[PDB]
Design an enzyme around this catalytic site. Structure first.
Site, PDB file in Angstrom:
ATOM      1  CE1 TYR A 179      35.078  36.269  44.361  1.00 30.97           C
ATOM      2  CE2 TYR A 179      35.271  34.011  43.580  1.00 30.97           C
ATOM      3  CZ  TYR A 179      35.445  35.356  43.380  1.00 30.97           C
ATOM      4  OH  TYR A 179      35.982  35.787  42.193  1.00 30.97           O
ATOM      5  CB  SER A 235      34.611  33.531  39.808  1.00 28.50           C
ATOM      6  OG  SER A 235      35.638  32.684  40.300  1.00 28.50           O
TER       7      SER A 235
HETATM    8  N1  NAP Z   1      42.259  37.474  40.023  1.00 31.53           N
HETATM    9  C1  NAP Z   1      41.603  36.313  40.097  1.00 31.53           C
HETATM   10  O1  NAP Z   1      42.180  35.275  40.404  1.00 31.53           O
HETATM   11  C2  NAP Z   1      40.128  36.268  39.790  1.00 31.53           C
HETATM   12  C3  NAP Z   1      39.572  35.068  39.355  1.00 31.53           C
HETATM   13  C4  NAP Z   1      38.215  34.989  39.069  1.00 31.53           C
HETATM   14  C5  NAP Z   1      37.443  36.130  39.220  1.00 31.53           C
HETATM   15  N2  NAP Z   1      37.983  37.285  39.642  1.00 31.53           N
HETATM   16  C6  NAP Z   1      37.075  38.423  39.745  1.00 31.53           C
HETATM   17  O2  NAP Z   1      37.598  39.548  39.033  1.00 31.53           O
HETATM   18  C7  NAP Z   1      37.182  40.761  39.678  1.00 31.53           C
HETATM   19  C8  NAP Z   1      38.402  41.610  40.012  1.00 31.53           C
HETATM   20  O3  NAP Z   1      39.456  40.738  40.418  1.00 31.53           O
HETATM   21  P1  NAP Z   1      40.929  41.270  40.824  1.00 31.53           P
HETATM   22  O4  NAP Z   1      41.754  40.053  41.162  1.00 31.53           O
HETATM   23  O5  NAP Z   1      41.438  42.198  39.751  1.00 31.53           O
HETATM   24  O6  NAP Z   1      40.523  42.065  42.193  1.00 31.53           O
HETATM   25  P2  NAP Z   1      41.415  43.159  43.002  1.00 31.53           P
HETATM   26  O7  NAP Z   1      42.805  43.246  42.387  1.00 31.53           O
HETATM   27  O8  NAP Z   1      41.225  42.873  44.474  1.00 31.53           O
HETATM   28  O9  NAP Z   1      40.643  44.532  42.693  1.00 31.53           O
HETATM   29  C9  NAP Z   1      39.232  44.564  42.885  1.00 31.53           C
HETATM   30  C10 NAP Z   1      38.693  45.980  42.755  1.00 31.53           C
HETATM   31  O10 NAP Z   1      37.383  45.995  43.342  1.00 31.53           O
HETATM   32  C11 NAP Z   1      37.274  47.113  44.229  1.00 31.53           C
HETATM   33  N3  NAP Z   1      36.351  46.885  45.362  1.00 31.53           N
HETATM   34  C12 NAP Z   1      36.344  45.844  46.224  1.00 31.53           C
HETATM   35  N4  NAP Z   1      35.355  45.996  47.149  1.00 31.53           N
HETATM   36  C13 NAP Z   1      34.720  47.155  46.877  1.00 31.53           C
HETATM   37  C14 NAP Z   1      33.588  47.914  47.455  1.00 31.53           C
HETATM   38  N5  NAP Z   1      32.920  47.454  48.543  1.00 31.53           N
HETATM   39  N6  NAP Z   1      33.256  49.094  46.869  1.00 31.53           N
HETATM   40  C15 NAP Z   1      33.920  49.569  45.791  1.00 31.53           C
HETATM   41  N7  NAP Z   1      34.952  48.923  45.209  1.00 31.53           N
HETATM   42  C16 NAP Z   1      35.384  47.735  45.704  1.00 31.53           C
HETATM   43  C17 NAP Z   1      38.685  47.405  44.711  1.00 31.53           C
HETATM   44  O11 NAP Z   1      38.818  48.785  45.061  1.00 31.53           O
HETATM   45  P3  NAP Z   1      38.920  49.249  46.601  1.00 31.53           P
HETATM   46  O12 NAP Z   1      40.298  48.818  47.045  1.00 31.53           O
HETATM   47  O13 NAP Z   1      38.779  50.752  46.519  1.00 31.53           O
HETATM   48  O14 NAP Z   1      37.780  48.535  47.306  1.00 31.53           O
HETATM   49  C18 NAP Z   1      39.538  47.011  43.515  1.00 31.53           C
HETATM   50  O15 NAP Z   1      39.791  48.158  42.685  1.00 31.53           O
HETATM   51  C19 NAP Z   1      36.415  40.349  40.939  1.00 31.53           C
HETATM   52  O16 NAP Z   1      35.009  40.426  40.673  1.00 31.53           O
HETATM   53  C20 NAP Z   1      36.816  38.905  41.167  1.00 31.53           C
HETATM   54  O17 NAP Z   1      35.776  38.161  41.822  1.00 31.53           O
HETATM   55  C21 NAP Z   1      39.300  37.392  39.927  1.00 31.53           C
HETATM   56  C1  2V4 Z   2      43.526  35.268  43.494  1.00 33.62           C
HETATM   57  C2  2V4 Z   2      43.076  34.462  44.719  1.00 33.62           C
HETATM   58  O1  2V4 Z   2      43.612  35.086  45.891  1.00 33.62           O
HETATM   59  C3  2V4 Z   2      43.605  32.993  44.617  1.00 33.62           C
HETATM   60  C4  2V4 Z   2      42.552  32.072  44.474  1.00 33.62           C
HETATM   61  O2  2V4 Z   2      42.538  31.049  45.152  1.00 33.62           O
HETATM   62  C5  2V4 Z   2      41.503  32.405  43.607  1.00 33.62           C
HETATM   63  C6  2V4 Z   2      40.989  33.683  43.797  1.00 33.62           C
HETATM   64  C7  2V4 Z   2      39.968  34.169  42.997  1.00 33.62           C
HETATM   65  C8  2V4 Z   2      39.450  33.361  42.002  1.00 33.62           C
HETATM   66  O3  2V4 Z   2      38.435  33.801  41.212  1.00 33.62           O
HETATM   67  C9  2V4 Z   2      39.944  32.071  41.769  1.00 33.62           C
HETATM   68  C10 2V4 Z   2      40.988  31.576  42.575  1.00 33.62           C
HETATM   69  C11 2V4 Z   2      41.470  30.274  42.336  1.00 33.62           C
HETATM   70  O4  2V4 Z   2      42.381  29.801  43.015  1.00 33.62           O
HETATM   71  C12 2V4 Z   2      40.918  29.497  41.310  1.00 33.62           C
HETATM   72  C13 2V4 Z   2      41.408  28.207  41.084  1.00 33.62           C
HETATM   73  C14 2V4 Z   2      40.889  27.407  40.074  1.00 33.62           C
HETATM   74  C15 2V4 Z   2      39.864  27.895  39.277  1.00 33.62           C
HETATM   75  C16 2V4 Z   2      39.378  29.178  39.497  1.00 33.62           C
HETATM   76  O5  2V4 Z   2      38.378  29.685  38.735  1.00 33.62           O
HETATM   77  C17 2V4 Z   2      39.894  29.997  40.507  1.00 33.62           C
HETATM   78  C18 2V4 Z   2      39.399  31.292  40.735  1.00 33.62           C
HETATM   79  O6  2V4 Z   2      38.488  31.744  40.034  1.00 33.62           O
HETATM   80  C19 2V4 Z   2      41.535  34.479  44.808  1.00 33.62           C
END
Ligand code: NAP
Ligand code: 2V4
Lengths: 245, 252, 253, 252
Positions: D159, D146
């Protein structure tokens, strides 16, 4: 007297090593120092004595970290000893120093060992900080002792480094959180810190010597004082040039 | 005075961070060579200020970025130190001098680029190279960098390039001088209130304050105090590193 | 493949080593490539020939970098060559690869050599970017070949590292600057790479270079070239202002 | 397709980045194990989409972060792998599954903390440990980290701690697995549209869009396409690194 006269400080795991030296040093600057240890009251008191011998003020505080209730026990003891000595609960300086290591190959790391590394090294620091916001005045200090192994690959300590990685995020994010309260939050990364094996660890530094416990403590004390008011959210490299590849 | 009987040179020292740095280092008991490019008077106003605190200091004139810059500087320095200490030992070197461009990327000319390199990167390299023969084992080298090496701002891209070059100096000279026990470190200031016309303007000041997590501009003092620490004994185990003196500007 | 079909690119210092392989990989993906070199016209024509044998498109461009008029000649030749083959001067991809090392102890470095390294390694890439902005479309690409020596201390090449740390700043600020035009700007940092020279014929030395990599081998020009190609394509549209560590884990220690 | 003949597991591939990563890897010809906690239909929807586009995938169900998670995951994984290939070979491991805290620092409970660690950092570690015997020399581990490891955000400090731990997993296993030719890397997204309610308000979106120098939010494919490159042969010489898939969010 010194930079830190009329200030109070808590150093976790400060019966031995960097913690001890940090406590001594902070005390030397005129700080009232809570000397914490997890299990040894004896070692903790040796430190408190030294500080008194050298003309400073300290008291021991025992509370095993890494177990349910650790934060209650730390603060119960800590807050009393502080009111006892100053009639206030103010804590100007927090040093998260306590930490335990793994010393096994990744294939031998147990779920239970992982839990405990996290519990002592990362979870306790989080909840110690969270509760300490209560006591830390505006213009206060938080210093987290990291590890060189966060910048330097060593598979034999992977779980340990993971937890110190986690601890370094405390620095970045609480620096931001505590901005409006004028509290600086920083990390200090040691190198290797004190056969023919001596000669090899000494090679890692550009100074061709091993680090001493004082080498880190002096940087902490700088961070703890007013000269460092404009440094926050950062990582200080007290390793004697070990990161230089 | 923890730096008593020590000598220090701070380039670009008649104003701003340099001024404050000299003043602070003097206050710690060190004899400070106050260097300036042009105004003999401004550099003497600093020397004056230092002496009124019971400190020891002398002005030095040397326009940086031109042929023979290093020569003129070390000529005056070696002279001033002999006259006062009977030696030419230089304990502390602070590479503080530097100039900015203040134009957009597309507006940078070859002449500006050359000029930024000459003052900000070339001069410090050769001032380090020359100072090696005067710095004792256990001495100090501190390079003043810029937060713009970590924070994007196209309006100063060429300037940042020269500062990134400066930090690489830090990295490699630190390795090179390890066996001689000289620490080499960079200090990166954030937005610092020097006295330019932008700081005369509030709303502009209000804008810049917001970059810091403490919600203020830096003061010259904020950076000098970090320099002073690296100059002292408490920082012997810190080398080859970058200290962030920006009040948490780099946090995003 | 056809991933870069319809695209054009310039790779500086493109007649040898990392530059050469980069030019080759881009062409393979469908890009029309300007192979630049400072002096050697034959070596540049050899790269062009190789690219053509594979069924790609390329032309050579001669322009000595680091001397007065370097950017001028480069782009004169670049623009003529591009116009002839496409009817446009559109430059989709710019790779700043060219650079020279110093090969001298920090004590032997003269004001002349310093000027020389700056002129070639920092000044030219800056002015090449500046001049290229007129040709690069929205959605375009800039890749700067840096060095692992910006991350790894080595006093033997300190002046060279300074010029390359200068080059990384190009990446940071131009990435910000060029955001509204959707151009990505990234740096790629090689480790030790086998560029074909006799040095790499000695196995005993090969092994001690290999040890710097977690894979226990030296890099191939192709290990770096393949990362550049990725940055240059659509799959890397969401990476900008960053530094790619194409050194086989040399920075782990 | 670059990945013909290869197999991949993507944890949490039932929605968001995981789903798009699964889809993109299947498109390059990989047999993809699509994973999530309990929702079978959610996993199968991803499988359906992959099959429509003429690819091969199967769903696997295991709640991460509870005693027995790993055993249940690999039992399902190998079964499905053997049924389709008659081997348990895992070429590509993507640690994508993750959960957020979403409360103020003062509000974090030990329970929430434990849960974030257990899912975000501990499960990836033990999944890796267990996968080591299935991953052949020349294979791939990709950890989804992240931007919050580099961008301050107190609302997600716990987190971000888990992701800081995650990046350490990358660094140290990259070294550990070098003699086996397995690359280990982190991909750190910025704000990425994952269907949650926050991306519906066109005002908060515009605000999030401003974090990138391209002035838009990331899409799931923006991140997946970076993972896909790491999963392939063109990225054999990158290991132990962090890929910044944020569209320039860390520039200041
Ligand atoms: N979108 C962003 O802004 C963002 C930014 C930086 C990093 N990330 C990282 O990217 C990854 C995925 O992000 P996303 O936004 O695509 O997440 P998401 O839409 O919430 O989907 C996450 C997936 O992880 C699974 N999961 C969560 N808890 C679990 C558990 N205890 N056991 C098994 N499966 C589990 C969920 O399936 P279930 O519903 O079956 O649990 C879901 O399929 C994460 O590691 C997150 O930290 C996201
Ligand atoms: C999608 C969300 O509900 C919104 C959010 O607050 C966030 C979340 C996951 C993230 O990994 C990030 C961010 C993020 O802003 C945000 C803002 C500025 C820089 C970032 O790397 C992030 C994030 O990585 C959860």
């Amino acid at each position: 007297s010194g930079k830190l006269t009329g200030k109070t400080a808590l150093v976790t795991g400060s019966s031995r090593g960097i913690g001890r030296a940090t406590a001594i040093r902070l005390a030397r600057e005129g700080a009232l120092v809570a000397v914490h240890c997890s299990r040894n009251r004896e070692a903790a008191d040796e430190t408190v004595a030294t500080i008194e011998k050298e003309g400073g003020r300290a008291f021991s505080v025992l509370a095993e970290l890494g177990v349910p209730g650790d934060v209650h026990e730390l603060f119960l003891a800590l807050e009393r000893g502080l009111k006892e000595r100053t009639d206030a609960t103010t804590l100007d300086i927090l040093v998260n120093n306590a930490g335990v290591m793994g010393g096994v190959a990744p294939e031998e790391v147990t779920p239970e060992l992982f839990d405990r590394l996290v519990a002592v090294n990362a979870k306790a620091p989080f909840f110690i900080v969270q509760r300490a916001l209560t006591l830390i005045p505006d213009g206060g200090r938080i210093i987290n002792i990291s590890s060189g192994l966060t910048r330097f690959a060593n598979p034999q300590e992977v779980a340990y480094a993971m937890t110190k990685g986690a601890m370094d995020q405390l620095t970045l994010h609480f620096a931001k959180h505590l901005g409006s309260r004028n509290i600086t939050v920083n990390s200090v990364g040691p190198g290797i810190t004190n056969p023919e094996a001596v000669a090899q660890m000494a090679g890692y530094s550009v100074f061709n010597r091993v680090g001493e416990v004082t080498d880190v403590a002096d940087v902490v004390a700088f961070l703890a004082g007013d000269d460092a008011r404009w440094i926050t959210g950062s990582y200080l490299d007290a390793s004697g040039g070990t990161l230089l590849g």
